[PDB]
Design an enzyme around this catalytic site. Structure first.
Site, PDB file in Angstrom:
ATOM      1  N   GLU A   1       0.737  -1.254   0.002  1.00 38.26           N
ATOM      2  CA  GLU A   1       0.005  -0.146  -0.011  1.00 38.26           C
ATOM      3  C   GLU A   1       0.849   1.333   0.026  1.00 38.26           C
ATOM      4  O   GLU A   1       1.949   1.277   0.707  1.00 38.26           O
ATOM      5  CB  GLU A   1      -0.784  -0.049   1.311  1.00 38.26           C
ATOM      6  CG  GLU A   1      -2.264   0.440   0.978  1.00 38.26           C
ATOM      7  CD  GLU A   1      -3.038   0.294   2.249  1.00 38.26           C
ATOM      8  OE1 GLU A   1      -3.168  -0.753   3.092  1.00 38.26           O
ATOM      9  OE2 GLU A   1      -3.986   1.347   2.502  1.00 38.26           O
TER      10      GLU A   1
ATOM     11  N   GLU B   1      -4.110   9.969   3.584  1.00 38.20           N
ATOM     12  CA  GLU B   1      -5.280   9.961   4.225  1.00 38.20           C
ATOM     13  C   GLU B   1      -5.243  11.205   4.837  1.00 38.20           C
ATOM     14  O   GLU B   1      -4.442  11.697   5.562  1.00 38.20           O
ATOM     15  CB  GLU B   1      -4.903   8.610   5.181  1.00 38.20           C
ATOM     16  CG  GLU B   1      -5.172   7.317   4.558  1.00 38.20           C
ATOM     17  CD  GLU B   1      -4.960   6.286   5.788  1.00 38.20           C
ATOM     18  OE1 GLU B   1      -3.722   5.904   6.028  1.00 38.20           O
ATOM     19  OE2 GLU B   1      -6.047   5.451   6.334  1.00 38.20           O
TER      20      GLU B   1
ATOM     21  N   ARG C   1       9.193   3.631  18.453  1.00 39.23           N
ATOM     22  CA  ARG C   1       9.060   2.887  17.755  1.00 39.23           C
ATOM     23  C   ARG C   1      10.480   2.070  17.531  1.00 39.23           C
ATOM     24  O   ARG C   1      11.466   2.987  17.737  1.00 39.23           O
ATOM     25  CB  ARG C   1       8.698   3.686  16.390  1.00 39.23           C
ATOM     26  CG  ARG C   1       7.337   4.007  16.148  1.00 39.23           C
ATOM     27  CD  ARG C   1       6.298   2.943  16.095  1.00 39.23           C
ATOM     28  NE  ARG C   1       5.065   3.346  15.745  1.00 39.23           N
ATOM     29  CZ  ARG C   1       4.525   3.947  14.599  1.00 39.23           C
ATOM     30  NH1 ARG C   1       4.961   3.878  13.594  1.00 39.23           N
ATOM     31  NH2 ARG C   1       3.129   4.331  14.607  1.00 39.23           N
TER      32      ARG C   1
ATOM     33  N   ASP D   1      -0.135   5.220   0.646  1.00 40.57           N
ATOM     34  CA  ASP D   1      -1.352   6.021   1.130  1.00 40.57           C
ATOM     35  C   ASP D   1      -1.216   7.350   1.486  1.00 40.57           C
ATOM     36  O   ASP D   1      -0.252   8.162   1.751  1.00 40.57           O
ATOM     37  CB  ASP D   1      -1.905   5.720   2.607  1.00 40.57           C
ATOM     38  CG  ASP D   1      -2.060   4.067   2.599  1.00 40.57           C
ATOM     39  OD1 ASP D   1      -2.703   3.636   1.666  1.00 40.57           O
ATOM     40  OD2 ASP D   1      -1.404   3.408   3.453  1.00 40.57           O
TER      41      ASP D   1
END
Ligand SMILES: OC[C@H]1O[C@@H](O)[C@H](O)[C@@H](O)[C@@H]1O
Ligand SMILES: [Zn+2]
Length: 266
Positions: free
Chosen positions: A94, A98, A258, A96
């Site tokens: 994908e 958004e 992360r 993206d």
């Protein structure tokens, strides 16, 4: 005084198409209207709506002029993206864009992301240097076998170069869009959720751009060019750095929570 000019305008060099020349409804046809090539789709308590490209692609520039809804839009996403989720269910790729809706008074967040074989968590988020509800703006995903670049009115906001096969989308992708209820995470990670007293929630798209190479295209096919110099110009890079210095609100590679080992391209 706006961003410093990118000094080249790929969107202007590619033919504007109407919706029906590149796309059909995927779902929520009753919440889709097309008027002279321009798309209107909307979300209420019964359904959102979404669309899908007619062709499946191996590379290209994929662009649309989009206008967002003002007011209370918390929990609502307006999307324009490349995906192969219907071809590789549960382990897909994908790329993206958004638009993450918001409570009154607060700005939209534009999130970019990349998924490879199920692996996402590659989000970068910005706010915009204009009101994306007041007028249509150009937004685009450029995808070749060497790079991904994300654009806003031909200003690059992000570049994701191919560093390894494991971290880059190398399978064919379709183009999609949708307006949908993503209350669990869209707005301040789900702090604020959809409120259907403000329905419908409308997304508007027009001047579709497809400077692209379908899977079926002749091997001579080249995607639209994003610079007259083969690579991002000095002006393009300066415009991009200005965006990242002044408008970026989240970058996965800089989030200390992360584990960047899991995203080795950082
Ligand atoms: O919102 C557009 C797309 O963004 C990404 C997610 O993988 C999808 O669930 C979503 O359809
Ligand atoms: Zn680590």
């Amino acid at each position: 005084q706006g961003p410093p000019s990118p000094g080249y305008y790929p969107s202007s060099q590619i033919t504007s198409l109407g919706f029906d020349q590149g796309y059909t409804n995927l779902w929520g046809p009753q919440h889709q209207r097309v008027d002279q090539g321009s798309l209107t789709i909307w979300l209420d308590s019964t359904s959102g709506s979404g669309f899908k490209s007619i062709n499946r692609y191996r590379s290209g520039y994929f662009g649309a002029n989009i206008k967002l809804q003002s007011g209370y839009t918390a929990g609502v996403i307006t999307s324009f993206y490349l995906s192969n989720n219907q071809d590789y269910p549960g382990k897909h790729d994908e790329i993206d864009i958004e638009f993450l809706g918001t409570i009154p008074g607060k700005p939209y967040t534009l999130q970019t992301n990349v998924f490879i074989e199920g692996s996402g968590d590659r989000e970068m988020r910005i706010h915009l240097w204009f009101d994306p509800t007041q007028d249509y703006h150009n937004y685009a995903i450029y995808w070749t076998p060497s790079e991904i670049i994300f654009f806003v009115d031909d200003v690059p906001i992000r570049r994701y170069p191919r560093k390894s096969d494991a971290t880059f989308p190398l399978r064919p992708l379709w183009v999609y869009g949708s307006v949908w209820d993503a209350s669990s995470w869209a707005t301040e990670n789900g702090k604020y959720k959809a409120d259907y007293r403000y329905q419908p929630f409308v997304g508007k798209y027009e001047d579709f751009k497809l400077g692209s190479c379908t899977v079926e295209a002749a091997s001579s096919c080249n995607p639209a060019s994003v610079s007259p110099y083969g690579q991002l110009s000095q002006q393009q890079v300066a415009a991009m750095e200005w965006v990242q210095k002044n408008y970026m609100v989240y970058n996965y590679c800089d989030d200390p929570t992360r584990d960047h080992t899991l995203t080795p391209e950082c």
